[PDB]
Design a protein around this ligand. Structure first.
Ligand SMILES: COc1ccc2c(c1)N(CCCNC(=O)c1cccc3c1N[C@H](C)CC(=O)N3)CCC2
Length: 114
């Protein structure tokens, strides 16, 4: 059983590491509004949108029972971006950088949580 405060304390630094990436985190910080962004087919392609602010809210409000659910949301965010965007795009390349950062951050943390 994982207490929500323990998950927050352990996992939030990994999320903060993503947020600190500039310019790479910028398209990932807030939920996608497809009409506002001029990408009206977004939710047709991306069935389960995810973004950094949603993940933070889930940690803040105790919505994860176990740490792999958090890892899965981060990876969902990445996979959505690699699915929707062209390989030359900023979002695609930025996603790839975030995945590099996340891999390094999450490893010791997951080992520590068990
Ligand atoms: C589009 O690339 C950039 C790169 C840098 C910056 C911005 C936009 N802008 C705008 C940020 C807001 N737009 C997006 O978030 C976005 C736009 C088009 C497509 C995608 C968008 N992002 C999500 C992940 C959905 C996605 O899969 N693809 C801010 C200044 C910095």
């Amino acid at each position: 059983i994982f207490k929500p405060e323990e998950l927050r304390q352990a996992l939030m630094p990994t999320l903060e590491a993503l947020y600190r990436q500039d310019p790479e985190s910028l398209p990932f910080r807030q939920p996608v509004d497809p009409q506002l962004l001029g990408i009206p087919d977004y939710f047709d392609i991306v069935k389960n949108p995810m973004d950094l602010s949603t993940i933070k809210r889930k940690l803040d409000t105790g919505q994860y029972q176990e740490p792999w659910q958090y890892v899965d949301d981060v990876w969902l965010m990445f996979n959505n971006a690699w699915l929707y965007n062209r390989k030359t795009s900023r979002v695609y390349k930025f996603c790839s950088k975030l995945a590099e950062v996340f891999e390094q951050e999450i490893d010791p943390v997951m080992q520590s949580l068990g």
